[PDB]
Amino acid sequence: VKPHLRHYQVVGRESPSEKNPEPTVYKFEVFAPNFVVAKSRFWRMMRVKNKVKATHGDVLSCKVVKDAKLVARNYLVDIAYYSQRCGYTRMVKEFRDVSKTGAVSQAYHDLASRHRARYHNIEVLNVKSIPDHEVKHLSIAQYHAPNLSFPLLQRRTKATRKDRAIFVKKNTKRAVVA
Amino acid sequence: FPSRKDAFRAQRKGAKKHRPEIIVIDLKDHVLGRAAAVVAKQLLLGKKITVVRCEQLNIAGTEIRNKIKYLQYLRKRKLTNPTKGPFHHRAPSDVFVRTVRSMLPRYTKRGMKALNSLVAYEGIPPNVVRTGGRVVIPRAQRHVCYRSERPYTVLGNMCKHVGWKYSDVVANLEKARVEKASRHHEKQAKLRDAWKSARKEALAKMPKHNVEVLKKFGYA
RNA sequence: CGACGUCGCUUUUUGAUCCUUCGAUGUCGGCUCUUCCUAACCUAGCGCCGCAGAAGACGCUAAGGGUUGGAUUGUUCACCCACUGACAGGGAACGUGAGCUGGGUUUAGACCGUCGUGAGACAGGUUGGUUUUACCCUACUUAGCUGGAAAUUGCGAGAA
RNA sequence: AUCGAAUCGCCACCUACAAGACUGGAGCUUGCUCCCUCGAAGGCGCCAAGUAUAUUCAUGAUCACAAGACA
RNA sequence: UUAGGGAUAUGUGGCGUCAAAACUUAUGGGCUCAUUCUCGAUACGUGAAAAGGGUUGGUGGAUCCACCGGCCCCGAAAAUGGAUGACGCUUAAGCCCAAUUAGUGAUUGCCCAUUAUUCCUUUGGUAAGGGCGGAAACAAAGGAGAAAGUGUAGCCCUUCCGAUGUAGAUGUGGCCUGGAGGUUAGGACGAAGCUUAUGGCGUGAGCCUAAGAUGGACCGGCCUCUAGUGCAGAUCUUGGUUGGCGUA
RNA sequence: UCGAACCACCUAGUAGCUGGUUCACAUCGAAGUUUCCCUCAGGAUAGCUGGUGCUAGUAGAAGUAUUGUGCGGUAAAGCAA
RNA sequence: GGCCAGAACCAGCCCUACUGCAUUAUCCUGUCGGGGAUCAAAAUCCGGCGGGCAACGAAGUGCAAGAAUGGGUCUUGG
Numbered sequence A: 001v002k003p004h005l006r007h008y009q010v011v012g013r014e015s016p017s018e019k020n021p022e023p024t025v026y027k028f029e030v031f032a033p034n035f036v037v038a039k040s041r042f043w044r045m046m047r048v049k050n051k052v053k054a055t056h057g058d059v060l061s062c063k064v065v066k067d068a069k070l071v072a073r074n075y076l077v078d079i080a081y082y083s084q085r086c087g088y089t090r091m092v093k094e095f096r097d098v099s100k101t102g103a104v105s106q107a108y109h110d111l112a113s114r115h116r117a118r119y120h121n122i123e124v125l126n127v128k129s130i131p132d133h134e135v136k137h138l139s140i141a142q143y144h145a146p147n148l149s150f151p152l153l154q155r156r157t158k159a160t161r162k163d164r165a166i167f168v169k170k171n172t173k174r175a176v177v178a
Numbered sequence B: 001f002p003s004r005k006d007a008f009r010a011q012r013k014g015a016k017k018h019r020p021e022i023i024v025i026d027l028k029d030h031v032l033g034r035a036a037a038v039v040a041k042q043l044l045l046g047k048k049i050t051v052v053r054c055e056q057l058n059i060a061g062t063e064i065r066n067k068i069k070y071l072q073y074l075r076k077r078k079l080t081n082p083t084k085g086p087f088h089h090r091a092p093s094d095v096f097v098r099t100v101r102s103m104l105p106r107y108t109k110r111g112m113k114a115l116n117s118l119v120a121y122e123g124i125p126p127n128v129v130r131t132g133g134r135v136v137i138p139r140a141q142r143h144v145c146y147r148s149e150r151p152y153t154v155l156g157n158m159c160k161h162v163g164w165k166y167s168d169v170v171a172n173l174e175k176a177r178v179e180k181a182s183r184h185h186e187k188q189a190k191l192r193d194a195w196k197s198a199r200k201e202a203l204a205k206m207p208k209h210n211v212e213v214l215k216k217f218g219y220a
Numbered sequence C: 001c002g003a004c005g006u007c008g009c010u011u012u013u014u015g016a017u018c019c020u021u022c023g024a025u026g027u028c029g030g031c032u033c034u035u036c037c038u039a040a041c042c043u044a045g046c047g048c049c050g051c052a053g054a055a056g057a058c059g060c061u062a063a064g065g066g067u068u069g070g071a072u073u074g075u076u077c078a079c080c081c082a083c084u085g086a087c088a089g090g091g092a093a094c095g096u097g098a099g100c101u102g103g104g105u106u107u108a109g110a111c112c113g114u115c116g117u118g119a120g121a122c123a124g125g126u127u128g129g130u131u132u133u134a135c136c137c138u139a140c141u142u143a144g145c146u147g148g149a150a151a152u153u154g155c156g157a158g159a160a
Numbered sequence D: 001a002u003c004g005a006a007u008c009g010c011c012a013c014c015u016a017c018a019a020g021a022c023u024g025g026a027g028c029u030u031g032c033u034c035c036c037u038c039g040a041a042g043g044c045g046c047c048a049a050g051u052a053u054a055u056u057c058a059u060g061a062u063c064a065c066a067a068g069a070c071a
Numbered sequence E: 001u002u003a004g005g006g007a008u009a010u011g012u013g014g015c016g017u018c019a020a021a022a023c024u025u026a027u028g029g030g031c032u033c034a035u036u037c038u039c040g041a042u043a044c045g046u047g048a049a050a051a052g053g054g055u056u057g058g059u060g061g062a063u064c065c066a067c068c069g070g071c072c073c074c075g076a077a078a079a080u081g082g083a084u085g086a087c088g089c090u091u092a093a094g095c096c097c098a099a100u101u102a103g104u105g106a107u108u109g110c111c112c113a114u115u116a117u118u119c120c121u122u123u124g125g126u127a128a129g130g131g132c133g134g135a136a137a138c139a140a141a142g143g144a145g146a147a148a149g150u151g152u153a154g155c156c157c158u159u160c161c162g163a164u165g166u167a168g169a170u171g172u173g174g175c176c177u178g179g180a181g182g183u184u185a186g187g188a189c190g191a192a193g194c195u196u197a198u199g200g201c202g203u204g205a206g207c208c209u210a211a212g213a214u215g216g217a218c219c220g221g222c223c224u225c226u227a228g229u230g231c232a233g234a235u236c237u238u239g240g241u242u243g244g245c246g247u248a
Numbered sequence F: 001u002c003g004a005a006c007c008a009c010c011u012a013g014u015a016g017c018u019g020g021u022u023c024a025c026a027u028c029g030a031a032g033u034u035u036c037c038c039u040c041a042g043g044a045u046a047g048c049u050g051g052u053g054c055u056a057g058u059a060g061a062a063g064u065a066u067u068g069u070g071c072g073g074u075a076a077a078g079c080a081a
Numbered sequence G: 001g002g003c004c005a006g007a008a009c010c011a012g013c014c015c016u017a018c019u020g021c022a023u024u025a026u027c028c029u030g031u032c033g034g035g036g037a038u039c040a041a042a043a044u045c046c047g048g049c050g051g052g053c054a055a056c057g058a059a060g061u062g063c064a065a066g067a068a069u070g071g072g073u074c075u076u077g078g
């Protein structure tokens, strides 16, 4: 399935005034479901880092960064999350995917599963594609062996939806009820 | 047993032997709850269903755990007068019937008719052996429902250890049935081979364009 | 075993409250009878001691079966004399009064002490003082008659 | 014998068995190669007793339970 | 958030059976095994602390050690037999994320309201408009109606909006009962009263017709007037009846 | 029939307390709060509600913003005041 | 026939199919260097330099106005 997060770049600034005729221009990378959420995260970061509020600012650009061609790659994601018991916790993890958005979505699902952390308590610090010889975890490194092969066992194959049945003859493909 | 009035009416009308449409289900290696749910829905839709080999159903978990669950169920009892209290059945077929009954509106006439449309057996009785091919429920089979690493129980052993008294009898009857069926199937192999050979040979005698149509549709 | 601290559980104690009942839910104890709980006194198995043996202590599974006779007191509680393998602790409208009993508490008679000018008062002592009704429904115990598988019908058909 | 009824696949090729972390057969190199019937079809049944220039169908008059049922 | 009814679509909540919806959806990712109040699926809320230890993650330090997270387990003892609502569920039908037919082509998977949109009908307005000098013509063997109007069987037609409610207020050419002043009818070819699987009308109080194989002498409608004027219960009053019962 | 007999009458004695209170549709629709009362199971009084209207029908409007201009000592902070 | 059914057409309403404009660069593609691995390779990855439209139904992206003119209405009237 296609990843549920998209890669946004937001460019913004503070509205000019007499005090600051020529304000600075800031660029921001985010992974959000849509551009409204992307703008919300951008303004939150601006408020908590540069003391600039959305009611006194301008958004000059909000665009989507297109993904590269699909190739099996190793992605390093530097991420952090908050919890009441332990404050802020930062970690660095490695995933295998075909795109940066896919890797980040996988990281979000993994954090939700293994630490019960939700979207709005998570900040993504960095994501990059790294070479095979720089991979440190064996669970990731095992997948770039030159002679990797394995069988498919314990499969559950369901029939095509139009052909599914309820009662079927014992050693026969004949359907009895539907 | 039919009444003499019914027999006389049948003789007067002059009708042949009648059997209603009945679906026979082999319940070996099936998941108890999922099989019960499917059967209950079909009964409410209005089918007639007969289930066999109820002693080889499966429940996830360990035999000790499921035996303890059954003992906890057996503890329930009306203190004032147990003759009016819950009735705990020990046979696997009765266990399956009770499980199905719990998934029906049993306190309405519609629910009671649906329940009475069901017949359950242990093993395969002679009156059911020769009635036609049996069916299975693909979405309730163990080899697609359970992960193979986990333990499971067989209903017959649990029933035998909680009070069922006919496991050995059922086993002997099943062994005799399998031996008899194996002998009969070892016979008639010549008939099957002859029919297959005749079907193979008929192609050389049938018309060529019919052969071509069969090849085009993949039945050649 | 365990101080100084600290966290919990229970509703078999007394408090706190005032939600139900004031054209009325019979109120203390005992006797009789049944059932339930375990925080285990005895009986069955184990573990460990500062367990040589004997006698014991501290735990775990376990509520299947047992847990007494009397003197004083209305007592519950208490204490003493004996027997025993042992004489464990509790719930059931503080189980149980159309089942009993009526000794206590709590009417009207009467005496004493203290209080009050007095009529009178006292969770102070004392003596005497009506315990009503089942033939109704259900529950329980025994005792009779009788249909019925579409659980009274359909002609609607399934044999371990 | 009341009785008119609802139901609309049948077989004497399914109506035997077991396993989904191993199904036709071998080989070592243990996941590849080679051989075979090539590894996702119970059999019939649907209007000439069988694929051929044979043969009665109305007026039951445009739908109506199917005016017909031992395949 | 509520006049009487259809159609479409939603809200909260759900899609294994009970029970409508994934006939147990995906060509989505991880985690979890729980032996007698029997893991979990409990918003409000209707169970659990300090302290400890099987798997799966993360920070530091060596050449394997400390630290702290997820899920699970111990800590965790009561009184009739019993409660994720029941069965059951473990390639979940459990927990945390995330979709809508799936790296294929861009925008709404499905189910359920006295809510929303729309259609029909009723009723009331701080309601808004139009018509009301009979245009002409027309015998049986195209038809009727047309009131200057609060309220009716509404003078007629078009249009828009609201409609629940205890205590309480008000309105009604709103219903019903005994008597009086008027007016207009009925009755021995059968008045009042009484009976009903007798239908018809009205939102309703009620009104009217039919039948009596009932009865035997009085009485209906309309406008005003008048009052000892409407019953399900007051441990209500008087009379009669009744299960208990062929019982004590 | 006695901690004040019985009979008739004043007597339908008084009750801030308990019980009851008979047809239908329609338009609207609350309060348990203030002050005084030998007041605390009751009243009067204002508020909430209904009816009737009067007046030149957009007027002297607003449980809401913006701009301008006043008021304040809670939350937080401090004890190096 | 003021009864029961079927089909046709008309008005209204309801639900379908048929879709263009902007954007893409942290991207596409050659070549040189180092870098990695192998049995030798390639590939994942990092610099420079030269060209660019990833255009198959390109893209999970920001708008959309496509009925000159497919079926339902015993959910409406003729």
Ligand SMILES: [K+]
Pocket: B076, B077, B078, B082, B083, B084, B085, B086, B087
């Ligand atoms: K019982």
Ligand SMILES: [K+]
Pocket: none
């Ligand atoms: K208490």
Ligand SMILES: [K+]
Pocket: none
């Ligand atoms: K190179």
Ligand SMILES: [Mg+2]
Pocket: C021, C022
């Ligand atoms: Mg009382």
Ligand SMILES: [Mg+2]
Pocket: none
């Ligand atoms: Mg009472």
Ligand SMILES: [Mg+2]
Pocket: C025
């Ligand atoms: Mg009593």
Ligand SMILES: [Mg+2]
Pocket: none
């Ligand atoms: Mg009493």
Ligand SMILES: [Mg+2]
Pocket: C094
């Ligand atoms: Mg108690």
Ligand SMILES: [Mg+2]
Pocket: C097, C131
């Ligand atoms: Mg008594």
Ligand SMILES: [Mg+2]
Pocket: none
């Ligand atoms: Mg009693």
Ligand SMILES: [Mg+2]
Pocket: C102
């Ligand atoms: Mg006494």
Ligand SMILES: [Mg+2]
Pocket: none
């Ligand atoms: Mg004195």
Ligand SMILES: [Mg+2]
Pocket: none
């Ligand atoms: Mg006494």
Ligand SMILES: [Mg+2]
Pocket: none
């Ligand atoms: Mg019968």
Ligand SMILES: [Mg+2]
Pocket: none
């Ligand atoms: Mg019969």
Ligand SMILES: [Mg+2]
Pocket: D065, D066
């Ligand atoms: Mg017929």
